[PDB]
Every structure is written in C-alpha cells, then in structure tokens.
Amino acid sequence: SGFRKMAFPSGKVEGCMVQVTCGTTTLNGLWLDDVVYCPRHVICTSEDMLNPNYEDLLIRKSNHNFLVQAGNVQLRVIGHSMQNCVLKLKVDTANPKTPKYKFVRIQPGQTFSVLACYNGSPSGVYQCAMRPNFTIKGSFLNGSCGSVGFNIDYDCVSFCYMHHMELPTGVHAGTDLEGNFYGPFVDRQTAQAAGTDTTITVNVLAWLYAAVINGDRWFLNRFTTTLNDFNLVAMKYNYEPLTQDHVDILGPLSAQTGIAVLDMCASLKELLQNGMNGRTILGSALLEDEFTPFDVVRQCSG
Amino acid sequence: SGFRKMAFPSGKVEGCMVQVTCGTTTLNGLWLDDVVYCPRHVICTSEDMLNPNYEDLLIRKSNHNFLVQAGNVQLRVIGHSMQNCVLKLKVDTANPKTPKYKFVRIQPGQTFSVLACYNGSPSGVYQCAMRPNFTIKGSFLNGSCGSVGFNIDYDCVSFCYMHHMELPTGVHAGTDLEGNFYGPFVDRQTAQAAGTDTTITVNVLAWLYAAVINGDRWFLNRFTTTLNDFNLVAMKYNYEPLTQDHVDILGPLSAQTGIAVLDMCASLKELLQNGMNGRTILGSALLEDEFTPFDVVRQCSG
Ligand SMILES: *[C@@H](O)c1csc(N(C)c2ccccc2)n1
Numbered sequence: 001s002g003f004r005k006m007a008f009p010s011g012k013v014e015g016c017m018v019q020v021t022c023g024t025t026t027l028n029g030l031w032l033d034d035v036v037y038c039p040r041h042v043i044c045t046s047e048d049m050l051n052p053n054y055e056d057l058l059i060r061k062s063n064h065n066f067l068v069q070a071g072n073v074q075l076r077v078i079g080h081s082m083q084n085c086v087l088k089l090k091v092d093t094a095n096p097k098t099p100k101y102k103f104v105r106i107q108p109g110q111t112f113s114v115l116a117c118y119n120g121s122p123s124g125v126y127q128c129a130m131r132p133n134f135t136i137k138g139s140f141l142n143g144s145c146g147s148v149g150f151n152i153d154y155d156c157v158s159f160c161y162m163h164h165m166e167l168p169t170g171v172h173a174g175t176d177l178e179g180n181f182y183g184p185f186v187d188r189q190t191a192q193a194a195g196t197d198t199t200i201t202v203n204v205l206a207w208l209y210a211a212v213i214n215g216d217r218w219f220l221n222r223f224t225t226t227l228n229d230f231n232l233v234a235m236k237y238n239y240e241p242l243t244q245d246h247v248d249i250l251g252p253l254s255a256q257t258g259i260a261v262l263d264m265c266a267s268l269k270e271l272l273q274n275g276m277n278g279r280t281i282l283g284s285a286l287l288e289d290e291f292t293p294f295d296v297v298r299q300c301s302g
Numbered sequence: 303s304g305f306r307k308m309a310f311p312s313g314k315v316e317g318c319m320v321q322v323t324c325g326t327t328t329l330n331g332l333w334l335d336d337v338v339y340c341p342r343h344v345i346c347t348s349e350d351m352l353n354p355n356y357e358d359l360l361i362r363k364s365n366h367n368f369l370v371q372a373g374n375v376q377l378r379v380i381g382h383s384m385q386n387c388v389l390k391l392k393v394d395t396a397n398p399k400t401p402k403y404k405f406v407r408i409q410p411g412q413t414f415s416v417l418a419c420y421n422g423s424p425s426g427v428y429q430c431a432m433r434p435n436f437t438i439k440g441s442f443l444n445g446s447c448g449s450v451g452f453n454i455d456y457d458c459v460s461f462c463y464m465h466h467m468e469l470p471t472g473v474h475a476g477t478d479l480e481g482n483f484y485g486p487f488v489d490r491q492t493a494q495a496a497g498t499d500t501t502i503t504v505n506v507l508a509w510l511y512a513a514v515i516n517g518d519r520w521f522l523n524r525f526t527t528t529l530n531d532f533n534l535v536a537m538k539y540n541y542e543p544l545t546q547d548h549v550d551i552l553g554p555l556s557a558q559t560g561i562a563v564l565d566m567c568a569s570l571k572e573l574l575q576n577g578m579n580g581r582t583i584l585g586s587a588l589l590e591d592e593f594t595p596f597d598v599v600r601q602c603s604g
C-alpha cells in the first residue's frame with residue numbers, strides 16, 4: 001500500500017547522457033548508437049535568439065565546432081544534421097550502454113519520467129504529465145536544455161520529451177525526439193505564453209480509484225450520474241470532457257474496487273461542488289490529475 | 303524554475319539489486335563487493351512469524367539454502383551471518399557495478415530516495431522522508447522487502463534504509479543497513495502500530511522559501527515573531543519545535559530571498575491560524591514537510 005509520484009528507474013537513461021558544447025553554449029545530449037541528439041538552440045547565442053535562421057546558422061558550422069563529452073571521454077563528431085528542432089551529431093563511437101528504445105510522441109494527459117541533467121551529469125528524477133495545453137510543470141534550471149523525458153516498458157525506453165525552455169509562467173516546453181515541439185511554442189524569442197489549461201478528468205478519476213484501493217473512501221456516495229450530466233458539471237469547473245473511451249479505460253479499476261465509473265463520477269461532481277471540507281485524499285487537499293489509469297494499476301497492482 | 307518531489311538518479315543502486323530466495327520466500331537484496339544484504343525475514347514462513355527465534359532459524363540453514371540471482375546469473379553463496387535484522391550472504395563474486403558507498407543512519411525529518419523492487423528488478427523511484435515517528439509513507443507491495451533507500455552525493459551512495467514491512471495504517475517500517483530498525487518496530491507479528499506523528503516544521507519553512515524562490519508570495523506578511531511565540535503556536539498545531547539550529551540552517555535561504563527566518567515563521571503562524579482561504583503554494587493546498595533545507599537549495603539553486 002501507499003501512493004507516490006513514482007518515476008521509472010533512470011539508469012538506462014543516465015547511461016546515455018552526454019555534454020554538448022558549441023561556441024560558449026553547453027547543454028545536454030542523448031547518445032544512442034552512434035548519434036547524439038540535442039536542441040538546435042546549441043548553435044545560437046543570446047543575440048541570435050531574436051529571430052535565428054537555423055539552416056543558416058548550421059551551414060556555417062563544422063563537425064569540429066561541436067565538443068561531445070561522455071563522462072570524461074571526448075567523443076569525436078563525424079557528422080551533423082538538423083532535424084526540425086533537434087540536432088543529430090553522428091559520432092565515431094556507438095554508445096555501449098544503448099538500451100532498446102523507441103522515439104514516441106505522447107498525448108496531453110499522459111505521464112513520463114524526467115531525468116534532469118546539467119553538463120551531461122544527471123541530477124534528479126521526477127514524474128510529470130503533458131498538460132492539455134502542451135506544457136509541462138517541470139523543475140529545470142539554466143543548463144537543463146536537452147534533459148529527456150521517458151517511459152520504460154520491460155527493458156525498452158520510450159523517449160518522449162526533450163527539454164528546450166521555460167515559459168514566463170515558470171512552466172516548460174520542449175519537443176519530441178524528432179525535434180517537433182509539443183504545443184504552439186518556438187525556439188525563438190517571442191512573447192510566447194502557455195495557453196489556457198484544463199484538469200485531466202480521467203486522471204482525477206484514476207486517482208480517486210487509487211485512494212479507494214488505499215482505504216480512503218470518505219468521498220464516496222450512493223448517487224450515480226449520466227456521462228452527460230457529469231460533463232455539464234466538469235465543463236463548469238474547467239475539467240476536460242470525459243468520453244466513453246475514458247469510461248472504458250477505467251473499467252479494470254472499477255471492477256477491482258466494484259465502484260462503477262459513473263458512481264465515481266457522482267463522487268467527483270460532489271467534490272467539485274462542495275470541496276473537501278478540510279479532509280484529504282492520499283495526502284492531498286486538492287484533486288490530483290497527474291496519474292493515468294496505467295500509473296494507478298502499475299503502482300496499486302504491480 | 304519549478305518545484306518537484308525529485309529523487310536521485312537510481313542507476314548506481316539498480317546495478318546492485320538482486321533476488322534472494324530461501325525456502326519459498328523471495329525478496330530483494332543489495333549486492334555490494336562480495337556480500338548481499340537482505341532482511342532476515344527471508345528465513346521465516348508465515349507461521350514462523352508469531353514469535354521467531356532468528357538465531358535458531360539461521361543455525362538450521364546452510365549456504366545452499368540461499369539462492370541469489372543477479373539478472374540471470376546465479377550467485378554462489380559461500381557464507382552467511384546475521385547482523386541484527388539483516389542477513390549478510392557472502393558470495394563468490396564481487397559486484398563489478400559496486401559504487402562508492404557508505405551505510406548511514408538518518409534522522410527523523412531527513413529525506414531519501416527509494417528504489418522499489420520486486421524479484422530483484424527495480425520498478426520505480428520516489429522520494430520520501432523519515433517521519434518523526436520513525437515510519438515512512440512509502441509505496442510498497444508484497445515482494446518489496448529488501449528495497450533500499452539512499453541519498454547520493456557526488457558519486458557516493460549513502461544507503462540509509464532497507465524496507466521490511468507495512469504497518470496497519472498503511473505506512474512502512476524498516477532498518478538501516480546494519481539491520482537496526484528505525485523506531486520501535488520488530489520483525490515479528492505483533493499488534494505494533496505507528497506512534498503519534500508531528501509535522502516537520504523546519505521543512506515546511508524550507509518549502510515556503512522554495513515557493514518564494516518560485517514566485518508564490520501571497521502568504522508573506524509584514525509581521526515578525528519570537529521563536530518562543532512561534533513554538534507556542536506550532537505546539538498547538540502538532541508541529542515539531544523549531545530550534546536555533548533550524549533557524550541557522552535556514553540562513554542561506556533567508557539571505558537568498560531576504561526574508562528573515564522569523565518573518566517566515568510569522569507567515570506560517572498565520573497560515574496555521576487562517577488556513578489557505580482556497581489558494582495554493584507550489585501546486586499544494588496543504589503545508590508540505592517532506593523537503594529539507596538541503597532539498598530546496600539543491601533544486602532551486604543546483
Ligand atoms: C535549450 O535547448 C534551449 C532551446 S530554446 C532556449 N532558450 C533559453 C530560449 C532563448 C530565447 C527564447 C526562447 C528560448 N533553450
């Protein structure tokens with residue numbers, strides 16, 4: 001029992017992290033087979049950011065402009081190319097610690113672990129979610145560019161996020177590993193800001209199911225509701241619509257607790273209308289939406 | 303910017319985890335140099351737990367009673383001994399992945415990362431604190447016995463916790479790596495229960511400082527207070543006393559934000575008297591006490 005913001009073990013990823021320097025810019029890269037992947041921002045200066053032409057900035061560079069450091073060992077760059085917002089630096093050595101891996105793109109509402117890194121050295125590991133507005137609420141300082149997000153299934157690392165920047169509200173934006181931003185954000189200097197955000201309803205439901213599995217039940221009730229009447233109330237509280245698919249995905253949790261999905265919705269509605277009246281759920285005084293149904297099963301079941 | 307429950311990267315620890323079987327009991331062990339460390343509970347059955355004599359149970363065992371599995375490779379046990387509540391199984395092979403390490407014992411109020419493990423395979427990594435009542439609020443299922451807690455400084459793993467069991471309230475109890483329980487808990491079947499718990503005041507203060515560093519400031523006020531008048535109120539709210547030492551340890555955070563420690567106490571007092579009035583601090587509606595002053599500096603400063 002117990003319910004924590006639990007990341008994947010980070011080892012397979014730590015063995016791929018490297019330091020990439022170009023000019024006076026240092027940041028992190030990801031070293032898989034004989035390629036290192038990193039934000040293209042590495043070829044810019046401060047004054048370049050106001051409107052860079054990256055195709056331009058790159059053609060004026062050479063392999064020798066890029067220093068790659070893996071631990072101590074210098075890696076020799078033998079090729080460079082841009083892929084959307086990432087660079088790919090071909091190097092003369094394949095990473096011996098390359099795991100089985102895939103580059104996936106996730107959806108808003110899905111979670112992943114982040115290995116924050118500085119100068120090629122991993123500093124910490126946490127879990128977060130892609131928000132509906134394609135930001136994440138990360139924890140990142142200067143130098144963290146190129147830190148990666150991931151999920152692990154069996155021995156296979158699904159890399160899903162590369163870190164690029166912090167927006168004015170203090171939230172974070174980045175790309176998939178093919179260099180395509182999550183959300184309408186650009187790697188240039190702009191008044192760009194996170195769009196309006198919502199609560200991930202299906203996740204809140206999944207977390208209510210975690211809480212019941214962990215013996216908190218005070219918020220349960222004998223009421224039920226229609227999907228439609230539920231969504232009427234969720235809309236009112238800036239919660240995302242719940243769909244039949246989400247109802248179906250909650251099925252195993254509903255069967256394991258014998259609470260019907262729509263009964264759990266009835267509970268949520270009342271929590272939205274009445275608040276908590278000073279109690280908590282899994283150590284929280286707020287409704288938590290950063291755990292997927294998969295997260296709950298994996299942690300409350302194995 | 304951003305503020306997360308951030309664990310240490312778990313890699314150095316994942317390379318030490320192994321599976322230990324004796325009889326029909328399987329659990330985890332920690333493989334450092336040519337020793338594997340594991341809970342002594344591994345030599346018991348269900349019916350042994352009612353009052354085991356472990357000195358007895360152990361003398362009736364042999365090296366061949368203990369199967370150690372590291373990944374695939376079988377490890378050969380060439381020696382066994384008990385040390386308080388842990389066993390030490392000498393094996394014929396030193397772990398090539400042994401990091402620099404130390405066995406430390408922590409205090410109530412200090413944090414550490416946990417690598418939950420099942421059958422020798424790491425499943426996830428999270429951060430928690432030793433509570434004032436020497437429990438932790440972990441997230442552990444059947445099979446998790448022997449999972450370890452740790453802190454990492456430079457390349458040196460300070461192992462501080464080995465997991466042994468879950469108490470009736472759903473919280474967790476275990477030992478240091480020399481086999482000495484944290485708190486008044488025993489590895490036998492007893493009506494044993496967590497004692498009364500308190501809030502770690504110094505940590506709450508440290509987290510208020512994190513929040514200011516991250517631009518939440520609504521809870522600040524122009525008041526101050528005495529240490530004595532503060533502790534009068536903290537006592538009333540089941541918060542631990544704050545000491546001069548804690549005031550001194552908060553000094554760098556106070557200097558970095560220019561809020562005096564005692565001014566921050568004045569803020570906390572008002573939050574304890576008035577509640578939050580529906581706002582939040584670093585995404586929380588509660589006062590959070592699982593980050594030390596060290597945690598905040600390391601994460602808001604590097
Ligand atoms: C590190 O990968 C990276 C890419 S974009 C960026 N910064 C600091 C930036 C500069 C100016 C405007 C937006 C973003 N960091």
Ligand SMILES: *[C@@H](O)c1csc(N(C)c2ccccc2)n1
Nearest residue numbers: 341343351447466467489490491
């Ligand atoms: C796994 O290390 C371990 C040691 S104590 C324990 N259990 C399940 C237990 C059984 C009976 C009374 C208290 C604790 N697990």
